[PDB]
Structure formats: structure tokens, C-alpha cells
Paper text:
Nbs are derived from natural llama heavy-chain antibodies that are devoid of a light chain and in which the heavy-chain variable domain (VHH) exclusively mediates the interaction with the antigen. The VHH domain is structurally similar to the IgG VH domain, with three complementary-determining regions (CDRs) that are responsible for antigen binding. We describe the introduction of cysteine residues at conserved framework serine positions in a Nb specific for human complement component C5 and subsequent site-specific labelling with Hg derivatives and structure determination by SAD and SIRAS. Hg incorporation did not perturb the structure of the Nb or its antigen-binding capacity.
For the derivatized protein we obtained crystals at two very different pH values of 3.5 (Nb36-C85-1) and 7.5 (Nb36-C85-2). To investigate the potential of the Hg-derivatized Nbs for rapid and automated structure determination without prior phase information, we analysed two SAD data sets exhibiting space groups P212121 (Nb36-C85-1) and P21 (Nb36-C85-2). For the P212121 case, 720° of data were collected to a maximum resolution of 1.5 Å. Analysis of the anomalous signal from the four consecutive 180° wedges indicated a significantly stronger signal in the first 180° of data compared with the subsequent 540° of data. Hence, in line with previous studies of Hg-substituted cysteine side chains, we observed a significant selective decay of the anomalous signal from Hg, whereas the overall data quality was preserved during the full rotation range. The pronounced decay of the anomalous signal inspired us to compare SAD phasing based on the 1–180° data with SIRAS phasing, in which the 180–720° data acted as the native data and the 1–180° data as a derivative with an anomalous signal. The SAD-based density-modified map based on the 1–180° data was used for automated model building and refinement with the Buccaneer pipeline, which traced the four molecules in the asymmetric unit almost completely. As already indicated by the site identification in phenix.autosolve, the structure did not contain a single Hg atom at each free Cys85 introduced into the Nb. Instead, two Hg atoms each bridge two cysteine side chains from two NCS-related Nbs and no density could be assigned to the benzoate moiety. This implies that the benzoate was released at some point between the isolation of monomeric Hg-substituted Nb and cooling of the crystal.
Numbering used by the authors: 3 to 119
């Protein structure tokens, strides 16, 4: 898969961002997708998942604050990020679910989110 993230930036605590992930091919239509984040001294962790049916789930720390969605026609996955806190500072990536362990996974450059206090 080919993946290009955008929308990150510097934001103030309490603010909002909308991240986009444009995917080549039909991955958005064919596979469950997720948004991941990698904090300074950590590994990539799944924070939001969207399943083929349109069902979603979230890690507890972002539930109610972040919303994952997709547009099949635009081959894009979105992460609406509200109620941002400094602890959300991280590099954000989108990918097929399982990409942290599955063979031949490919990652984009990610998009950096920095939340100031
Ligand atoms: Hg909130």
C-alpha cells in the first residue's frame, strides 16, 4: 500500500485538528484501517480503528475525543481530533490493521502533531 498522511501541526491545548490519509489502490474499500501514533520514546500504537461495515473503536484515552471515518471514493481515511492535550503530541500514521506485525507492511512518512500548553 502507498500512504500519504497530512493535516498535522502545532495546536494549542483544547484545540482541534483533522488528519487525512490518502491511500493508493483499494485498501480503504478492502481492509480494516486504523490510525496509529508514535510518541517520543515509544513504538507505534493503534488509537482508532474503522471496520469494513463502518463500525469503529478507539483506545480509551481518545474515545469521545477522536473520530475515525473514511471516504471510499476519495480513498481517504480521516481522524478528527478534538479536545487535544499535550500528551497527544506524537507522529501519526494510518495503515491496514495489523501493520505493526504483519509481513511486508509499509508505512508513510506520518504527520506530526504537537500540542502546546
Ligand atoms: Hg472531548
Amino acid at each position: 500500500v502507498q500512504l500519504v498522511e497530512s493535516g498535522g501541526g502545532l495546536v494549542q491545548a483544547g484545540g482541534s485538528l483533522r488528519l487525512s490519509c490518502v491511500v493508493s489502490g483499494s485498501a480503504v474499500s478492502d481492509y480494516a484501517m486504523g490510525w496509529y501514533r508514535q510518541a517520543p520514546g515509544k513504538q507505534r500504537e493503534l488509537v482508532a480503528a474503522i471496520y469494513n461495515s463502518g463500525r469503529t473503536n478507539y483506545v480509551d484515552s481518545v474515545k469521545g475525543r477522536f473520530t475515525i471515518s473514511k471516504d471510499n471514493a476519495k480513498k481517504t481515511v480521516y481522524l478528527q481530533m478534538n479536545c487535544l492535550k499535550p500528551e497527544d503530541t506524537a507522529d501519526y500514521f494510518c495503515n491496514l490493521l495489523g501493520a505493526t506485525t504483519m509481513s511486508n507492511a509499509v508505512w508513510g512518512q506520518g504527520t506530526q502533531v504537537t500540542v502546546s500548553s
